[PDB]
Design a protein around this ligand. Structure first.
Ligand SMILES: *C/C=C1/C(=C/c2[nH]c(/C=C3[NH+]=C(/C=C4\NC(=O)C(C=C)=C4C)C(C)=C\3CCC(=O)O)c(CCC(=O)O)c2C)NC(=O)[C@H]1C
Ligand SMILES: *C/C=C1/C(=C/c2[nH]c(/C=C3[NH+]=C(/C=C4\NC(=O)C(C=C)=C4C)C(C)=C\3CCC(=O)O)c(CCC(=O)O)c2C)NC(=O)[C@H]1C
Lengths: 315, 313
C-alpha cells in the first residue's frame, strides 16, 4: 500500500523497520557522506546558509568565516557562470559542474544545482578513447543480451568494481540480474530474481529523475548539515539531487550484510520509466572520482537509447 | 543503381542524375589527413594516399610493402580484437599514437569485409559536455531543445553557423533552429527540397553519422592504387571521415560562401530525423577529440528528440 512520507528522524519521525519500508523520507536525511562537503546558498543574494560539519576541512576555512561571506566573494569566477547556467525556476535535475583550484585542498570538483530559491554546492576532490570505443561497440551489439554483456564488461573495465550487474525491472517492480561481470571467486547473481520492495517505491521514483547515486563506504557515519533545517523555510533541505546525500541506514545495513563496502548504480530510463540499473559492488570502500563518474553517466544515456533500439528489434 | 565512378570512365554528375553518384567510392581523401588500407589477416598495406609520406614521415615504397605488425606493434593486436572478421563497417576503433615524425596522431580504423581502413590525423594532449548534456535534458520542449543544441555546438566549436535541419516526410528540409555569428544571412525558417540532400546520401547518413568538408577549395588526394588489389574494385570509403567530398556538394558550399562544413546525423526509430549542420566561412579542421564530443551529442540529441516528441504526441 502506498502511503505518504514520515517526517525525518530529526523532526521526531519514527525509526524505520521492515514494516514501514516505503515511508522513510530518503531525500531529506539532513546529512551527507564524508568524502565531500556541501554548502547551501540563497539563490539571489548568494548568502551561505547551511554547510556540512566537515566543510572547514575541505575548504580550509572556519565556519563563521564561510557563513559570513556571499558566493560572489567566495567564488568570484564561478558565481556569474552559476547564475547564467541555473536560472530561477529551472528544474532541480539540471546540474552545472566546474573544476576549482583551491589553495588548501588541491583540485576540487564543484557540482551545483538549484532547488527553488536554494543553490546546493557539492565539493569533492578530483584527479583515453575508451568511451568512444565503447560507444561504437554498444551500438554494434547484435541483440539485447550481447548489449547487456558488453555494457557490464565495459563498466567493470573502466571502474575496477568487483561486480557490475545489469538489473532489470519487471512490470511488478521485481528485478532480475540479466547480465553481470564479476571478479574471480565471487558467486553469480545472474538469473536471480528479487522482490519488489527490495528497491521500494519512493526510491524508484527518485531514481527516474536523478540518475546516479552511490555509497562510497557502507560503514561511514553521515555528516550533518549545520544548521539541519534550511533557515529560509525552517524546513528540511531537499537533497535528492545531491550525490553526496547520506544513504539511508536501512540500505546501508543490507549492503553490509552482503559484504559490500562500496555501491554505485546508474539508472536506465526508457519511455519515461525506470527500465533497469547498472549496479556496481566493491568489497572494500571505494571512491570513484567525479570525472570517471561522468563517463558512467554518459553510458547510462547511451544504454537507454540502445535498449530502446534493441527492444524495437523484437516484437 | 549507381553510375561507375569517374576514374572507371563513368558519366560526370549533373543536376539530372543527382541520385546515382557513388559518393562512397571516390578513390580519394581530403588532404588534412592520410589513409592506408590493409589486409585483415596479414596486416599488409595494400593502398595508401599519395600524401602518406608527409604525415607518416616514411619513404614512399617502405609503406606499401610493410605490415601493420611491423608498422604499429602495440596497436596491431588491439585492432585484431576490436574489429573481428564479420563485424559491421560502422564499428570503429580509435587510438592516439606518439609517432616520431608527428608529435601525436589520431588513428581511426574500421573494417569492410577483408580490408582494414586506417585514418591518420594530427591530434593533441572539460565539463562543457556534461553541462550540455544536463541542459539538453532540462529543455522543456522540442523548440527549446533545438535552440540549446545549436547554441551548445556553436560554443564548443566556434563554427560560424550551426543549424538544426529537420527532414519532412518527403525529405523536404527545414532549418528549425540556428546559432550564428553576427553578420551572416539567417537560414532560420527556410525549407529546401528533398533533392538538396539526395536519397543515397541520406541512406549513408543513416549508418555513418558524422561527415565534414574541411576546406571547400582543397583538391582531393588519390589512393594508390585506386582499386583494391584484393578485389580489383573500388575501396568503400563510406565509413571514412577523410573520404573525398562529392564535388557536386563542395560546389554548393562554395556558391553559398562556406569554406568549412560539418554535420551530425540525428537518427530516431532507425530513420534519419535531421542533422546538426555547421558552417564556417573559412577552412577549418576540427580536431578528432572535439569531433568525438559532437558524436556524443548526436546520440544524446537522438534520445532527447524522441523523449520530447513523445510529450507532444
Ligand atoms: C525496509 C527497507 C528495505 C530497503 C530499503 C532501500 N533499498 C534501497 C535501494 C536498493 N536496494 C537494492 C537491492 C539489491 N541490491 C543488490 O545487489 C540486488 C541484487 C543483486 C538487489 C535486489 C538496490 C540495488 C538498491 C539501489 C541502490 C544501489 O544500487 O546503489 C533504498 C534507497 C537508497 C537511497 O536512496 O538512499 C532503500 C531505502 N531495501 C530492502 O531490501 C528492504 C529491507
Ligand atoms: C545534384 C545534387 C545536389 C546535391 C548533392 C549532395 N548533397 C549532399 C549532402 C548535403 N546537401 C545539403 C544541402 C544543404 N546545405 C545547406 O546548408 C542547406 C540549407 C541551409 C541545404 C539544403 C546538406 C546539408 C548535405 C549534408 C552534408 C553536410 O552537411 O556536410 C551530398 C552528399 C555528400 C557526401 O556524402 O560527401 C550530395 C552528393 N546537393 C544539392 O543541393 C543538389 C544540387
Amino acid at each position: 500500500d502506498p502511503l505518504p512520507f514520515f517526517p525525518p528522524l530529526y523532526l521526531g519521525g519514527p525509526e524505520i523497520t521492515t514494516e514501514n519500508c516505503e515511508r522513510e523520507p530518503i531525500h531529506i536525511p539532513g546529512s551527507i557522506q564524508p568524502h565531500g562537503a556541501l554548502l547551501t546558498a540563497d539563490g539571489h543574494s548568494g548568502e551561505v546558509l547551511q554547510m556540512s560539519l566537515n566543510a572547514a576541512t575541505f575548504l580550509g576555512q572556519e565556519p563563521t568565516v564561510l557563513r559570513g561571506q556571499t558566493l560572489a566573494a567566495l567564488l568570484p569566477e564561478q558565481w556569474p557562470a552559476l547564475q547564467a547556467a541555473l536560472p530561477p525556476g529551472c528544474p532541480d535535475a539540471l546540474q552545472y559542474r566546474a573544476t576549482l583550484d583551491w589553495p588548501a585542498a588541491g583540485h576540487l570538483s564543484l557540482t551545483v544545482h538549484r532547488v527553488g530559491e536554494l543553490l546546493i554546492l557539492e565539493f569533492e576532490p578530483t584527479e583515453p578513447h575508451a568511451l568512444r570505443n565503447a560507444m561504437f561497440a554498444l551500438e554494434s551489439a547484435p541483440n539485447l543480451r550481447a548489449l547487456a554483456e558488453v555494457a557490464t564488461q565495459t563498466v567493470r573495465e573502466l571502474t575496477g568494481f568487483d561486480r557490475v550487474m545489469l538489473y532489470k525491472f519487471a512490470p511488478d517492480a521485481t528485478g532480475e540480474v540479466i547480465a553481470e561481470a564479476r571478479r574471480e571467486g565471487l558467486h553469480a547473481f545472474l538469473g536471480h530474481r528479487f522482490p519488489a520492495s527490495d528497491i521500494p517505491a519512493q526510491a524508484r521514483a527518485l531514481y527516474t529523475r536523478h540518475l546516479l547515486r552511490l555509497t562510497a563506504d557502507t560503514r561511514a557515519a553521515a555528516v550533518p548539515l549545520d544548521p539541519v533545517l534550511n533557515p529560509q523555510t525552517n524546513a528540511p533541505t531537499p537533497l535528492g539531487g545531491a550525490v553526496l546525500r547520506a544513504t539511508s541506514p536501512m540500505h546501508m545495513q543490507y549492503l553490509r550484510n552482503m559484504g559490500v563496502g562500496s555501491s554505485l548504480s546508474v539508472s536506465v530510463v526508457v519511455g519515461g520509466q525506470l527500465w533497469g540499473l547498472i549496479a556496481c559492488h566493491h568489497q572494500t570502500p571505494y571512491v570513484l572520482p567525479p570525472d570517471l563518474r561522468t563517463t558512467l553517466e554518459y553510458l547510462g544515456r547511451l544504454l537507454s537509447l540502445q535498449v530502446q533500439v534493441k527492444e524495437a528489434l523484437e516484437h
